[PDB]
Design an enzyme around this catalytic site. Structure first.
Site, mmCIF file in Angstrom:
data_model
loop_
_atom_site.group_PDB
_atom_site.id
_atom_site.type_symbol
_atom_site.label_atom_id
_atom_site.label_comp_id
_atom_site.label_asym_id
_atom_site.label_seq_id
_atom_site.Cartn_x
_atom_site.Cartn_y
_atom_site.Cartn_z
ATOM 1 N N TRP A 1 -8.436 -8.919 -2.967
ATOM 2 C CA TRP A 1 -8.567 -10.059 -2.074
ATOM 3 C C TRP A 1 -7.517 -10.084 -0.987
ATOM 4 O O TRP A 1 -7.844 -10.393 0.193
ATOM 5 C CB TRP A 1 -8.439 -11.386 -2.879
ATOM 6 C CG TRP A 1 -9.450 -11.439 -4.005
ATOM 7 C CD1 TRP A 1 -10.654 -10.732 -4.093
ATOM 8 C CD2 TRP A 1 -9.380 -12.280 -5.147
ATOM 9 N NE1 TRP A 1 -11.318 -11.086 -5.278
ATOM 10 C CE2 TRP A 1 -10.546 -12.013 -5.934
ATOM 11 C CE3 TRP A 1 -8.423 -13.198 -5.605
ATOM 12 C CZ2 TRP A 1 -10.773 -12.666 -7.149
ATOM 13 C CZ3 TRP A 1 -8.623 -13.842 -6.899
ATOM 14 C CH2 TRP A 1 -9.776 -13.537 -7.624
ATOM 15 N N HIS B 1 5.463 -8.090 3.631
ATOM 16 C CA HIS B 1 6.772 -7.324 3.429
ATOM 17 C C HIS B 1 7.927 -8.268 3.111
ATOM 18 O O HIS B 1 8.889 -7.855 2.458
ATOM 19 C CB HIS B 1 7.015 -6.474 4.660
ATOM 20 C CG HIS B 1 6.064 -5.301 4.740
ATOM 21 N ND1 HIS B 1 6.476 -3.989 4.833
ATOM 22 C CD2 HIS B 1 4.705 -5.270 4.723
ATOM 23 C CE1 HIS B 1 5.414 -3.186 4.797
ATOM 24 N NE2 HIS B 1 4.324 -3.929 4.739
HETATM 25 CA CA LIG Z 1 11.844 -11.535 1.012
#
Ligand SMILES: [Ca+2]
Ligand code: HEM
Ligand SMILES: [Ca+2]
Length: 315
Positions: free
Chosen positions: A164, A47
């Protein structure tokens, strides 16, 4: 180089990481366990890093999700990320490394606690973030395969690299997808970095482990597992299904490709030749002991085979 406490590392600038490694293992990962805090720190690396768009901006793996948390934790795809950002922020304030370095260092140290895991290459020296991520750059579980592939491609990952990187969901669980059953994992071995995630998402869906109507959730094959719609579709879509099945019972490939592609992700927005390699500070992970398998009592007839070129392996 030899650090003040006698531990060695190839480049002397890396010595400052040792007290930070000790603090993280004791006080972030609860005594070097492969548990929720590691899983949450691995989610944080993505994130943070994925806030990177050539046309919109964001500095990728820059620590912006901590430095500009008031903004980025408002984005709906960052739901639940506020807990791990709050847990990591005081480590960043206490130690003398940037938030972008800390997030990638904590994610690499965490993966090294998990049997089967790898040491993700780790570079020291990211400058502090200078801008918040743009909105709407983190894929969500209700997005189509084409949407997820286009976003990840826009940040620099091919479809096979997407598959992956999703080996991460081998050490992973969901709290917000179905808030009635927080902590329900995506594979049967959420404390083991192994191929079970790629096996179990290939099974036919059977039930919902909690309630039935959650956005982004597919039927699971097992009462104690949750399945995201994104993972359900990626395992079946012609763009990614053959790569997905190629990871089953292929731990060497999972290890090599996850380490390499994690390193590429940890460097989004950065320039490796400006940083210092401190890979050898990461602990050595334990190895696997048990073989890959279908869940007991299941058989090939329960697998939805989705690769025309290659039959699903007989496990
Ligand atoms: Ca960032
Ligand atoms: C490719 C598209 C992806 C989608 C749509 C997606 C979606 C999700 C969702 C919906 C959750 C559960 C959040 C919750 O409700 O608590 C989750 C958890 C997690 N994701 Fe992914 N993810 C993706 C890629 C990745 C990548 C590239 C990584 C690499 C680090 C990652 C690592 C994790 C981990 C480790 C967790 C478990 C967090 C925990 O147990 O505390 N994900 N993901
Ligand atoms: Ca697993």
């Amino acid at each position: 180089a030899t650090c003040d406490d006698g531990r060695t590392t190839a480049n002397a600038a890396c010595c400052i990481l040792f007290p930070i490694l000790d603090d993280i293992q004791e006080n972030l990962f609860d005594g070097a366990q492969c548990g929720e805090e590691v899983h949450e720190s691995l989610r944080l690396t993505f994130h943070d890093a994925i806030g990177f768009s050539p046309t919109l901006g964001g500095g990728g793996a820059d620590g912006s999700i901590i430095a500009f948390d008031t903004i980025e934790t408002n984005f709906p795809a960052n739901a639940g990320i506020d807990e791990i950002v709050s847990a990591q922020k005081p480590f960043v304030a206490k130690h003398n490394i940037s938030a972008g370095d800390f997030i990638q260092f904590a994610g690499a140290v965490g993966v090294s606690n998990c049997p089967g895991g790898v040491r993700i290459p780790f570079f020291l020296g990211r400058p502090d973030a200078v801008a918040a991520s743009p909105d709407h750059l983190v894929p969500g579980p209700f997005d189509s395969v084409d949407s997820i592939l286009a976003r990840m491609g826009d940040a620099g990952f091919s479809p096979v690299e997407v598959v992956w990187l999703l080996a991460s969901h081998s050490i992973a669980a969901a709290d917000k997808v179905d808030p009635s059953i927080p902590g329900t994992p995506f594979d049967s071995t959420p404390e083991v970095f192994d191929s079970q995630f790629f096996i179990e998402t290939q099974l036919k869906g059977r039930l919902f482990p909690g309630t039935a109507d959650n956005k982004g959730e597919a039927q699971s094959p097992l009462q104690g597992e949750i399945r995201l719609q994104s993972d359900h579709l990626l395992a079946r879509d012609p763009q990614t299904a053959c790569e997905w099945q190629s990871m089953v019972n292929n731990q060497p490939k999972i290890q090599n490709r996850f380490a390499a592609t994690m390193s590429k992700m940890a460097l989004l927005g950065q320039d490796k030749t400006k940083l210092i390699d401190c890979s050898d500070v990461i602990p050595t992970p334990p190895a696997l002991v048990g073989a890959a398998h279908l869940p007991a009592g299941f058989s090939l007839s329960d697998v939805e085979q989705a690769c025309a070129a290659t039959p699903f392996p007989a496990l």
